Amino acid sequence: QVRGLEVGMRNANDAISIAQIAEGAMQEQTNMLQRMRDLTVQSENGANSSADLS
Amino acid sequence: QVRGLEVGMRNANDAISIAQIAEGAMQEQTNMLQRMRDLTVQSENGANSSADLS
Incomplete structure (x- = not known):
């Protein structure tokens, strides 16, 4: 038992x-997913063009 | 939420x-339209001739 x-x-x-x-x-x-979430929120901007989206 | x-x-x-x-x-x-309004009121002058109207 001891052993x-x-x-x-x-x-x-x-x-x-x-x-x-x-x-x-x-x-x-987790950290990288938070970064992608910020990038996705930034994509919703009526001043972005196709180059910025790319 | 913060980000x-x-x-x-x-x-x-x-x-x-x-x-x-x-x-x-x-x-x-707006400014230019006001100027055109003044020119149009000036066209209604029984002393103007065709050259002044032009």
């Missing part, structure tokens, strides 16, 4: 590592 | 710019 609990805590820390990497990756994706 | 309000105020100022340019253009047109 198994030691190895199990090692596995639990491995799981925390995986979750932490993935969760940190999703933050930059 | 969208920022971009929306930018669009609103663009609209104010467009309206201000067009509204300023119409003033010279």
